[PDB]
Design a protein around this nucleic acid. Sequence first.
DNA 1: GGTTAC
Length: 170
Amino acid sequence: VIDSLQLNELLNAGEYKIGELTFQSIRSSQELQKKNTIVNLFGIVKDFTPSRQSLHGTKDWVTTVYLWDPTCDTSSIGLQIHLFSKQGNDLPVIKQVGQPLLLHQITLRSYRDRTQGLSKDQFRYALWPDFSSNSKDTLCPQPMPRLMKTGDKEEQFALLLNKIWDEQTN
DNA sequence: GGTTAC
């Protein structure tokens, strides 16, 4: 039951809790850190690339998303995150930009002086509908393996995020 | 862990 002012309070602190998980704001994440730390993220899908199997390396499936949250400029593209899956395609099925996404277990690291996010093997996630859409089926059924059960605490934070995102781009 | 992605 938090409003638009509490959201800014939390985020502007770097680390913040929601439910039983501590989250890193998009901003503080990009604080280019050499040491690879694992974090949880919560934000709006600013842009994404559909699931495609890699053509090299261990050839794992990979979907890419760019995350956005208030601590960013409505202009910036967000934090880049590559989500990999060695166990088949049980990755987030994203329909459109604007959808709130919670990610659990993301390695933060550097690529060409910038910060980048790489998914841990056992990463889990939760995806919400794009509330600010004339469509009500913006969220399609998700694969179960990595799907987190969420409560009203994160549901509220997801509404807030999508609301604040909608305003800054209407 | 950070090759695949880029």
